[PDB]
């Protein structure tokens, strides 16, 4: 895996049962692996750092990132979604050391039954 | 007088008393439930210590010009939920739990029930009364349906709004629930 | 391993199947494990004694502690929830040897499936 | 043995033991205390009865308490579970010593019946 | 020796599901015998079954019922007896050696209910 | 080991029927399935099976359906005898014949999609 | 040796379709899958189909979709024969052509989302 790979950062709020060394997939094909997860001692929030293969390198700065289960009884894996790319207007590309913003979160088998008729 | 049992006793009695006095007018005009919920109950419930939880750490950042608006809109929201909730009235009982000695803590859980022969098997609804410092009398600040809370599901659901928008986001969007009823009684 | 440990006590009344040495987590990341479980001979109420590391040590007492399950056929664990700090009303950061005031019961199955859909 | 453990015995009757076996755990509030001993029938009425034991440290239980069998997880062992009742001092209550019987009881759960009474 | 001398009984059915031989028979959760034979009637194509009961229990009125139900949630199958009540003058016929039960119930299959309702 | 005789049938959605799977009537096993194949003119599935010879009074009006045993267990085909009456030709079955009507398998996705309209 | 040839098509969400999977029609296997990949621009996945030669003569209009097996099985790319019509439904699928219509996979949270909320 000698090919260089560049890294990105993100923050969540309730990741669930995610675990290190899990795949990142686009459309259904694997691309990059997840590196590190931790907390912050100032506000207490889950923070993740991941790496991306260098070949794919033309992303708009607007995109989506969300986690979702696998198959039916499988584990967890991130899911990226390409956003809208607008000509003329400013969009540019994702370089190193950046961060993706708007993200969703997991779901655990209690809040469902909760919201069910409250 | 700090015994919560006697307070809950008189509260249930007065509630069902004022409730019994109306049968057709309430369903002819839903504007009476939102009235009677304020006519009682609310003197026994506390708003500050309740509405403080849903905010979270962000409370340490709220400006004095913003706190009062949220604190005011919270009651106006809270009325409608309990208003709509009251849609049953089958003359059901409320067997209070038995007496017990001195509480060994300033936080105490108390339980009631409700039974009727016309409906499904019964259900229990725990309550929490907090023993404050020098407030003399005590108030209630929560309700537990059955293994499920009512401040837990809402503490995180109104989430990402707090990260991106802010307190300003929750304001106005809270009151924006309109005034309605149900046509399926 | 680094073990500058604190200990804390809590009480309950129904704990499902929480066996000994189970993990405890905040927001989805592990921060300690339960230690000693016993019963009380005065009134019969289960009591738990847990321990915490020293890196994270700024919790205000106005906090909650509940029990929940993992996945669909996993093992139970203890979730935590942080509150706010404010003078007069609620102060006193947790010192070593204290008890967590709040608690919530365990979720039971069969009961609700009998209750609803009746 | 489990080192000494002095114990005593109790009796009960039921109506449908489901799938309970021998040497099964008895627990209160999710904490185990004693195990079950013997199960048998009645040649005069055909109603299952059970004889269980209890470790002798715990020496305070009111006469009015409940027993009920149940299942764990969603597909595992079936275990008994008792619930302490409230005692009234000024009235007539009693503790339980060796060779007594518990008053009330509960039945068991089963499929088929409910799934055919509803949504049929 | 598995057991003492016993005695046999016969019954009929309409669809026995996946009931295999060497299956238990129980009352109230306790087992009291086994299953002997299952066969077919070459004149009307209706399945019949023959089973046995140990000589210990020796008092069952004729009015009773028999049914099939699944073991646990995802297991095997086991016959289930159900006793009537004791009423002299009216129902007297004691279960002798080699008789047939009057009333019976049928089995249950999965995909049929989906078509029956909730479709 | 018996002297067996063979029958033909056509279908529409085999639903993962594997060769050598039992054939049952009223829950009792009788014959075995021989093989399955395709047609080079209509592109439809056909099935050849064989039956024991002692049973020999199943008339023409009859059915074949597909169904699965247990919850997520195996699957097989169930035969269904039809009520016989006088006047009309009974038509007893002999070797090398074919069944007329039948039924098809079931697919999961469509039921879900129908539950949500 | 399978004297086979190749076909090409597109998709958008392939769920979990690893290589070496059947290409069944009516519950009968008649091919395989060799390669899946991604175009270095629009970022839309594409696949490579291989079928044997006896089953030729297929109208250029048909259908192709993805399905799962049983309850907790795997996944198998399935086909649906279209229709043959004179004049405006002509020709066949020669060596190395493209399929028109598609039908994406199915995910869990879409269902739960359409329900509840």
Numbering used by the authors:
A (entry chain F), C (entry chain E): 35 to 152
B (entry chain H): 24 to 208
D (entry chain D): 33 to 152
E (entry chain C): 34 to 152
F (entry chain B), G (entry chain A): 36 to 152
From the paper:
The Maintenance of Lipid Asymmetry (Mla) pathway is a multicomponent system found in all gram-negative bacteria that contributes to virulence, vesicle blebbing and preservation of the outer membrane barrier function. The pathway consists of an OM lipoprotein component (MlaA), found as part of a complex with either OmpC or OmpF7,8; a periplasmic GPL chaperone (MlaC) which shuttles GPL across the periplasm; and an IM ATP binding cassette (ABC) transporter complex (MlaFEDB). MlaFEDB consists of four proteins: MlaE an ABC permease protein; MlaD a membrane anchored MCE (mammalian cell entry) domain containing protein forming a homo-hexameric ring that faces the periplasm; MlaF, an ABC ATPase; and MlaB, a STAS (Sulfate Transporter and Anti-Sigma factor antagonist) domain protein proposed to have a regulatory function.
Masked refinement and 3D classification, focusing on one MlaD hexamer, revealed two distinct species, one with a single MlaC bound to a MlaD32-183 hexamer, and another with two MlaC molecules bound, with final resolutions of 4.35 Å and 4.38 Å, respectively. In the MlaCD(1:6) structure, a single copy of MlaC is bound offset from the central cavity, on top of the main MlaD ring, predominantly interacting with a single MlaD32-183 monomer (henceforth termed MlaD1) but making additional interactions between both the clockwise (MlaD2) and counter-clockwise MlaD32-183 (MlaD6) subunits. MlaCD(1:6) has a Cɑ RMSD of between 0.7 and 0.8 Å in the core fold across all pairwise protomer alignments. In the case of MlaCD(1:6) binding clearly results in the 6-fold symmetry of the MlaD hexamer being broken, as evidenced by changes in the angles between MlaD monomers. Interestingly, the largest deviations occur distal from MlaC binding, for example between MlaD monomers 2, 3 and 4. Importantly, such a break in symmetry was not observed in the structures of MlaD within the MlaFEDB inner-membrane assembly, and is therefore possibly not representative of the physiological binding event. Whilst MlaC Pro124, does not make any observed close contacts in our structure, however, based on its position, the most likely location for interaction would be with the β6-β7 loop of MlaD2. The presence of two GPLs within the central binding pocket and a single MlaC bound can be reconciled by both GPLs binding to a single MlaC monomer.
